[PDB]
Design an enzyme around this catalytic site. Structure first.
Site, short mmCIF file in Angstrom:
data_model
loop_
_atom_site.label_atom_id
_atom_site.label_comp_id
_atom_site.label_asym_id
_atom_site.label_seq_id
_atom_site.Cartn_x
_atom_site.Cartn_y
_atom_site.Cartn_z
N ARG A 55 46.78 8.35 27.52
CA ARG A 55 47.91 7.00 27.01
C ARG A 55 48.87 7.11 26.89
NH1 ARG A 55 46.60 7.59 20.86
NH2 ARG A 55 46.60 5.36 19.98
N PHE A 60 56.06 4.59 20.77
CA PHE A 60 54.96 5.81 19.94
C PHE A 60 55.73 6.84 20.40
CE2 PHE A 60 50.52 5.77 18.63
CZ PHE A 60 50.99 7.28 17.48
N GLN A 63 49.96 11.10 25.25
CA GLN A 63 49.47 12.10 24.53
C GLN A 63 48.89 12.69 26.37
OE1 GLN A 63 46.30 10.15 22.68
NE2 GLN A 63 45.28 12.14 22.11
N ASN A 102 44.20 15.13 16.86
CA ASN A 102 42.75 16.35 16.82
C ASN A 102 41.87 14.76 16.14
OD1 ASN A 102 45.27 16.50 14.28
ND2 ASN A 102 43.62 14.79 13.74
N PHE A 113 50.85 15.59 21.98
CA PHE A 113 51.29 13.98 22.25
C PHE A 113 52.82 14.31 21.81
CE2 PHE A 113 52.15 12.33 17.41
CZ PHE A 113 51.70 13.51 16.64
N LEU A 122 52.21 10.19 10.31
CA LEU A 122 51.27 11.49 10.41
C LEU A 122 52.10 12.97 10.16
CD1 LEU A 122 52.01 10.46 14.91
CD2 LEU A 122 50.00 9.25 13.45
N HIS A 126 48.55 16.30 11.55
CA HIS A 126 49.11 16.21 12.77
C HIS A 126 50.21 18.12 13.14
CE1 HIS A 126 46.36 13.63 14.69
NE2 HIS A 126 46.91 12.45 13.85
#
Lengths: 165, 11
Positions: A55, A60, A63, A102, A113, A122, A126
């Site tokens: 992904r 951004f 991942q 997660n 990521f 985040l 994270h």
């Protein structure tokens, strides 16, 4: 002590692209750093080598790390299935940040990521545990194969990985 | 939205 340095040799549809090296903050999140380091060397009999970045969303993050299901639903830590959020000391301050994916509080497995932008939303949710040391240009190249929904246009794999320091 | 989950990716 010295923070461990690990590398990933990235390939696009089997074509080697380049090497990305990461510094892991073992001095701040030892358990999380150790998990990533062991998974990069494959010393426990399983790891990142051969897995893909499933992904990628331009601007951004990228991942990857699902070496069991290869679709975002799998992976496991070297401590068992999942482990606790060690601490939230470090933040998602800019491009190059390495952080844990997660499915809610205390569900860290193997997925991670690499941020290509500051992602402050985040923070506290994270666990940040390392950063790109060299090869940020390779991460930028990788981003070109991503899309808004995350689907990649080419297969982006970790061809080889290991520890340098 | 812009989340990084494992299993149920959200908006």
């Amino acid at each position: 002590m010295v923070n461990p340095t690990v590398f990933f040799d990235i390939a696009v549809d089997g074509e080697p692209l380049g090497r990305v090296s990461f510094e892991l903050f073992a001095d701040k999140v030892p358990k999380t750093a150790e998990n990533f380091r062991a998974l990069s060397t494959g010393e426990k009999g399983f790891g990142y080598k051969g897995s893909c970045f499933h992904r990628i969303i331009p601007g951004f993050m990228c991942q990857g790390g699902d070496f069991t299901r290869h679709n975002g639903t799998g992976g496991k830590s070297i401590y068992g299935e999942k482990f606790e959020d060690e601490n939230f000391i470090l933040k998602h301050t800019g491009p190059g940040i390495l952080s844990m994916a997660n499915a809610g509080p205390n569900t860290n497995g193997s997925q991670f990521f690499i941020c290509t932008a500051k992602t402050e939303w985040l923070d506290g949710k994270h666990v940040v545990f390392g950063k790109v040391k060299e090869g940020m240009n390779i991460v930028e190249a990788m981003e070109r194969f991503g899309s808004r929904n995350g689907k990649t246009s080419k297969k982006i794999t970790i061809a080889d990985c290991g520890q340098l320091e | 939205x812009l989340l990084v989950t494992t299993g149920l990716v959200l908006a």
